[PDB]
Amino acid sequence: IVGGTASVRGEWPWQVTLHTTSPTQRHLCGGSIIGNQWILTAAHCFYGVESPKILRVYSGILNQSEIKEDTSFFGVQEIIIHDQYKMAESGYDIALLKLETTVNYTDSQRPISLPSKGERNVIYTDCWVTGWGYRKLRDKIQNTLQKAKIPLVTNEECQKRYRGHKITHKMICAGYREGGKDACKGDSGGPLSCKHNEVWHLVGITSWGEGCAQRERPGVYTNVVEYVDWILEKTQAV
């Protein structure tokens, strides 16, 4: 996160850090708890991941320093990538992780509500992006979970800023015209969380952008409300 500040412990209790153990253990991406066995994240995070066996999900974390060899984690049973996904910039950048065990909810770890098809009309004015990603374009993963408050921009405006791309209705953009606050490398897969009528909703998933926090280059996020039917289909037992 560029231009953000340190989070308060437990203020984003749906945020997880997804690690890979290959070749040695490191943070791979962010994600969000949406159900007792389910994390919602970005499909592009799984490039070159050939098995869920190398993944570890940690919940209730503020500082990466909390994660040691003796720290409990959730194994991943299954990676479900949207079948239309090809790459982040073409959309469909959404994946589910089915956990091996269920999360016991607590003040430190609990699910975020999905957006309602009914709140598509709502003007979300209280939106935050969070993660352990870079604080500049070439940097490193941060110890403390960062947060930044960022305004949504209309799809028409976002399209004007990305002339070589198609910004579709399945994407949502957020940023300041002057830049300075944005997600960056390592924040991918984490939430864009918006507070409306005293309830937090998972509005976006951090997906892509040109650089980080540049002038006239808003961040691009998966528009989660366009995938609530997909999420329901994929999380039902069969």
Same domain, 120 and 91: no
Is 53 exposed, middle or buried (CB count within 10 Å of its CB: 0-12, 13-18, 19+)?
exposed
Q: Which entry of 19, 27, 32, 44 is annotated as an active-site residue? A: 44
DSSP 3-state assignment of 234?
helix
| Residue 26 annotated as part of some ligand binding site | no
Same domain, 32 and 5: no
119 to each of 124, 130, 179, 225, 226, how far by Cα in Å? 9, 22, 27, 9, 12
| Residue 160 annotated as part of some ligand binding site | yes
Same domain, 87 and 45: yes
Q: What is the DSSP string of 208-231?
A: E-SSSS-TT--EEEEEGGGGHHHH
What is residue 2's DSSP assignment?
B
| Distance between CA atoms of residues 237 and 5, nearest Å | 40
CB neighbourhood size of 231 (10 A): 18
Query: Which helix (H) or strand (E) segment is 207 a member of?
Result: strand 199-208
93 is catalytic: yes
Same domain, 8 and 117: yes
Same domain, 44 and 130: no
Query: Which helix (H) or strand (E) segment is 232 a member of?
Result: helix 228-235
44 is catalytic: yes
Domain that holds residue 7: 1-12+112-226
Same domain, 3 and 117: yes
Same domain, 218 and 235: no
Pairing mode of beta strands 146-149, 55-58: unpaired
Which CATH number does the domain housing residue 106 bear?
2.40.10.10
| Distance between CA atoms of residues 186 and 29, nearest Å | 5
Residue 185 neighbours by CB under 8 Å, 6+ apart: 133, 134, 137, 139, 212
Same domain, 216 and 198: yes
Q: Which entry of 7, 93, 182, 187 is annotated as an active-site residue? A: 93
Q: Which entry of 188, 193, 201, 207 is annotated as an active-site residue? A: 188
216 to each of 61, 69, 127, 192, 232, how far by Cα in Å? 33, 42, 19, 19, 35
When divided into structural domains, the chain yields a total of 2
Residue 229 neighbours by CB under 8 Å, 6+ apart: none
| Residue 163 annotated as part of some ligand binding site | yes
Resolution in A: 1.6
DSSP 3-state assignment of 97?
strand
Q: Which amino acid is at 49?
A: V
| Distance between CA atoms of residues 99 and 78, nearest Å | 7
Same domain, 43 and 17: yes
Q: Which technique was used to obtain these atomic coordinates?
A: X-ray
Same domain, 201 and 165: yes
Same domain, 72 and 44: yes
- Compute the 3-state secondary structure of the chain and give helix, strand, coil in percent, each to the nearest 5: 15, 35, 50
| Residue 162 annotated as part of some ligand binding site | yes
CB neighbourhood size of 136 (10 A): 13
CA terminus-to-terminus distance, the chain: 38
Note the residue count of the chain: 238
